[PDB]
A paper describes a structure:
Among them the berberine bridge enzyme (BBE)2-like proteins (pfam 08031) can be set apart due to their unusual bicovalent attachment of the FAD cofactor. Here, we show that the enzymes catalyze the oxidation of aromatic allylic alcohols, such as coumaryl, sinapyl, and coniferyl alcohol, to the corresponding aldehydes and that AtBBE-like 15 adopts the same fold as vanillyl alcohol oxidase for berberine bridge enzyme and other FAD-dependent oxidoreductases. Furthermore, mass spectrometric analysis has shown that AtBBE-like 15 is located in the cell wall and thus might participate in as yet undefined reactions relevant for the formation of the cell wall. Thus, we suggest that AtBBE-like 13 and AtBBE-like 15 participate in the adaptation of the extracellular monolignol pool prior to polymerization and are thus involved in cell wall formation required during certain growth phases and in response to stressors.
Protein crystals were obtained using sitting drop conditions yielding diffraction data to 2.1 Å. AtBBE-like 15 adopts the same fold as other BBE-like enzymes, i.e. the VAO-fold that is characterized by a FAD-binding and a substrate-binding domain (shown in green and orange, respectively). The FAD cofactor is bicovalently linked to the peptide chain via a covalent bond of His-115 to the 8α-methyl group and of Cys-179 to the C6-position of the isoalloxazine ring. In the case of AtBBE-like 15, the gatekeeper residue is a leucine (Leu-182), and thus oxygen reactivity is suppressed because the side chain blocks access to the oxygen pocket. Tyr-117 and Gln-438 are engaged in a hydrogen bond on the si-side of the isoalloxazine ring (2.6 Å). Therefore, these residues were defined as substrate coordination motif. The hydroxyl groups of Tyr-117, Tyr-479, and Tyr-193 point toward the active site with distances to the N5 locus of 4.8, 4.6, and 5.0 Å, respectively. The ϵ-amino group of Lys-436 is located 3.1 Å above the plane of the aromatic ring of Tyr-193 and engages in a cation-π interaction. This arrangement of Tyr-479, Tyr-193, and Lys-436 presumably favors deprotonation of the phenolic hydroxyl group of Tyr-193 and activates this residue as a putative active site base, and thus these residues were defined as a catalytic base motif. The docking result suggests that the orientation of the allylic alcohol toward the proposed catalytic base Tyr-193 is possible, although the aromatic ring is located in the hydrophobic pocket, and thus this orientation is consistent with the productive catalysis found for AtBBE-like 15 with this ligand.
Numbering used by the authors: 27 to 42, 45 to 300, 305 to 532
The structure:
C-alpha cells in the first residue's frame, strides 16, 4: 500500500485510461525514472545526487489528468511541482527543498498548437516549446510572428507567465503584453478560462511567475506582423579594438534606437595563452539591410557595421539565427523541442538606469578574467517597453530601463568547481550594486535567484517581492490569498498568501 499506489487509485477513481506508462518511479524502473527526471531539466547543478528527488513523476496525457493530479495530490497532502519546459534557473520545477515528499507533474505531452490567422491568434498548450509555437505560426504565414523568448526550447507553461521578453520586445512589448485568454486549473481541480478566473487572476498570470497561480494548461496568444525579409548581423569587438568605449556607446543609445532595431550584447572572455574580453553585438532588424545601414550610420557608427555583415532572411530564420542555430539547420529543427546543450550554471539579473561608466566596466573585466566561463548578456529596452505602465501587468521593468543584464557563470564538472563559481558571481554581483538599479535592485522573475531570499528563510518576502515586481507585489499577494488561500501552489519564491 505505497504512496504511488494510493496516488494511482485516486487517479483512476476519477471518471476520466491506463496511465501506468505515464508514471515514473525508483521502484518501477530506477534507470527510466532518472532519464525522465533529467530529460528536460536544463540546469545540471540541480540534477546532482545531493538534490532532493521526487517520489515519482506523472506525465498527464489530457487536461483531465492534470485536474485529477491536482485533486489527488491535495487529497494525499502531496507537494506538487509543475514542469513544462524545464528551464528554471533554480531548478524549481524538478527540485523542492524541505517538502518531502514531492511529485513532479510534467506537462510535456500537452504540446498542441492551433494557429488561426483569420483572428490573428493561436492556442498553445503548456508543454509546447516556444520554438514549436514559432514554427507553427510561420507554417501558416511568412508575415506572422510572436514576441516571446530567444531560446527555442522554452516551455510555454513556465515562460509566458513570467513575462517572456525577446528580440521583438522593443516593438511589440512582452509575450505577456500579447495574450488574449488562458486555461488554468485551480486548487480545487476546476478548469478556468479568463472569463471564469476573472480579471485579477488573469492579470496575475501575466508576469507573476510560475508555480504560484495554478496550473496553466494553455495560452491564447495574439500574433504580430513581421516582414517577409528580416535582417540580422553579429559584430564582434575585443578590448584591443576599443571594446570598452564601444560598449559604453551602446549603453547610451541602444534603448533609443528605432523600434525595429534590437541589438543585444553577448560578452565573454576570449583567447587572444592569455585572455581578453569579447563583445558580440547580435541584432535583429525588422526591415531591409539598406534601411539598417542608414539607421546605424546615424546612431551607432562606432560599431563599424557594413553591408557585408548583414544577412537578409525570413523571420523564422532570424529567430534561429539569434537562438544560435547553425545555418545548416532548418526550421523543422524547432520541432524537436530540445535545448542545444546543457551545463551547470548560476545566474543573476540586473536592470540599468544610467550607463555603467568605463571604469566600472574595466573593474568588471578584471573580475571576468578571474573566472573559468563567465558570460553576460545585455538586452536593450526602450521602444514599446517605455510606453507601458509599471502596473499594467505584474512585470514592472518599463520606462527608465536602459537595458537588462543577465549574469552567468557556467561549468562542466558539477560539485567539483561549483563552490568557486558560486562565490565568484556573488562577489561580482556585490561589485555591480553601485552601478545598477537601486531601491529596489530590480530582478527578472524568470531569471530565478534564490539568493534574493525565500518564503521560509529569514528574508521577508516583501524584500525579494519588490525586486521582481516592484509596486505590483502587494496586489499579487492579495490575489494569491483570494485564489489559493491554502497555499497549494507554492515553492521557495512563490507569491505568499499573506505578508508579515
Ligand atoms: C533555459 C533558458 C531560459 C531562458 C532563455 N532565454 C529567455 C528569453 O529570451 N526570454 C525570457 O523571457 N526568458 C528566458 N529564459 C528564462 C525562461 O523564461 C524561464 O526559465 C522560464 O521559467 C522557463 O519556463 P519552462 O521552460 O516551462 O521552465 P519550467 O522549469 O518547466 O518552469 C518554470 C517555472 O514555472 C513553473 N511552471 C512550469 N509549468 C507551469 C504551468 N503549466 N503552469 C504554472 N506554472 C508552471 C514551474 O514550477 C517553475 O517554477 C534561454 C534559455 C536557454
Ligand atoms: C528500465 O528502463 C530502462 C531505461 O529505459 C531500460 O533500459 C534501457 O533499455 C533500452 C531498450 O533495450 C536500451 O536501449 C537502453 O540501453 C537501456 N538503458 C541503458 C542506458 O542502459 C530498461 O529496459 C527498463 N527495464 C525494465 C525492467 O523494463
Ligand atoms: C521615463 O524615463 C525617463 C528617464 O528617466 C524620464 O526622464 C521620464 O520622465 C520618464 N517618463 C515618464 C512618462 O515618466
Ligand atoms: Na521569509
Amino acid at each position: 500500500s505505497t504512496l504511488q499506489q494510493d496516488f494511482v487509485k485516486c487517479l483512476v477513481d476519477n471518471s476520466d485510461f491506463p496511465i501506468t506508462a505515464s508514471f515514473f518511479s525508483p521502484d518501477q524502473n530506477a534507470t527510466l525514472f532518472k532519464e525522465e527526471l533529467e530529460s528536460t531539466a536544463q540546469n545540471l547543478r540541480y540534477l546532482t545526487p545531493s538534490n532532493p528527488k521526487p517520489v515519482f513523476i506523472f506525465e498527464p496525457l489530457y487536461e483531465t489528468h492534470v485536474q485529477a493530479a491536482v485533486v489527488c495530490a491535495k487529497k494525499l497532502q502531496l507537494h506538487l511541482r509543475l514542469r513544462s519546459g524545464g528551464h528554471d534557473y533554480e531548478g524549481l520545477s524538478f527540485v523542492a527543498e524541505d517538502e518531502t515528499p514531492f511529485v513532479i507533474v510534467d506537462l510535456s505531452k500537452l504540446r498542441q498548437v492551433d494557429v488561426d490567422l483569420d483572428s490573428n491568434s493561436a492556442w498553445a498548450h503548456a508543454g509546447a516549446t516556444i520554438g514549436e509555437v514559432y514554427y507553427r505560426i510561420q507554417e501558416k504565414s511568412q508575415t506572422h510572428g510572436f514576441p516571446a523568448g530567444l531560446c527555442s526550447s522554452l516551455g510555454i507553461g513556465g515562460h509566458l507567465v513570467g513575462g517572456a521578453y525577446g528580440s521583438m520586445m522593443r516593438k511589440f512589448g512582452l509575450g505577456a503584453d500579447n495574450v488574449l485568454d488562458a486555461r488554468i486549473v485551480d486548487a480545487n481541480g476546476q478548469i478556468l478560462d479568463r472569463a471564469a478566473m476573472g480579471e485579477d487572476v488573469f492579470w496575475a498570470i501575466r508576469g507573476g511567475g510560475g508555480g504560484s497561480f495554478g496550473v496553466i494548461l494553455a495560452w491564447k496568444i495574439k500574433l504580430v506582423p513581421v516582414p517577409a525579409t528580416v535582417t540580422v548581423f553579429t559584430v564582434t569587438k575585443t578590448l584591443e579594438q576599443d571594446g570598452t568605449k564601444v560598449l559604453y556607446k551602446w549603453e547610451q543609445i541602444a534603448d533609443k534606437l528605432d523600434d525595429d532595431l534590437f541589438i543585444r550584447v553577448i560578452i565573454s572572455p576570449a583567447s587572444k595563452g592569455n585572455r581578453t574580453i569579447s563583445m558580440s553585438y547580435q541584432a535583429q532588424f525588422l526591415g531591409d539591410s539598406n534601411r539598417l545601414l542608414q539607421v546605424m550610420q546615424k546612431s551607432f557608427p562606432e560599431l563599424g557595421l557594413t553591408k557585408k555583415d548583414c544577412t537578409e532572411m525570413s523571420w523564422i530564420k532570424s529567430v534561429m539565427y539569434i537562438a544560435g542555430f547553425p545555418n545548416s539547420a532548418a526550421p523543422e529543427a524547432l520541432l524537436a523541442g530540445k535545448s542545444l546543450f546543457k551545463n551547470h550554471f548560476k545566474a543573476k539579473s540586473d536592470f540599468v538606469k544610467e550607463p555603467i561608466p568605463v571604469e566600472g566596466l574595466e573593474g568588471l573585466w578584471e573580475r571576468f578574467l578571474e573566472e573559468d566561463s563567465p558570460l553576460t548578456i545585455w538586452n536593450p529596452y526602450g521602444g514599446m517597453m517605455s510606453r507601458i505602465s509599471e502596473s499594467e501587468i505584474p512585470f514592472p521593468h518599463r520606462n527608465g530601463t536602459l537595458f537588462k543584464i543577465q549574469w552567468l557563470s557556467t561549468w562542466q564538472d558539477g560539485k567539483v568547481s561549483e563552490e568557486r563559481h558560486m562565490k565568484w558571481i556573488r562577489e561580482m554581483y556585490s561589485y555591480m550594486e553601485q552601478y545598477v538599479s537601486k531601491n529596489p535592485r530590480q530582478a527578472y522573475v524568470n531569471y530565478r535567484d534564490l539568493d534574493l531570499g525565500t518564503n521560509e528563510g529569514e528574508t521577508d518576502a516583501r524584500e525579494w517581492g519588490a525586486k521582481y515586481y516592484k509596486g505590483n507585489f502587494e496586489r499579487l499577494v492579495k490575489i494569491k490569498g483570494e485564489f489559493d488561500p491554502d497555499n497549494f501552489f507554492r515553492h521557495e519564491q512563490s507569491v505568499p498568501t499573506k505578508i508579515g
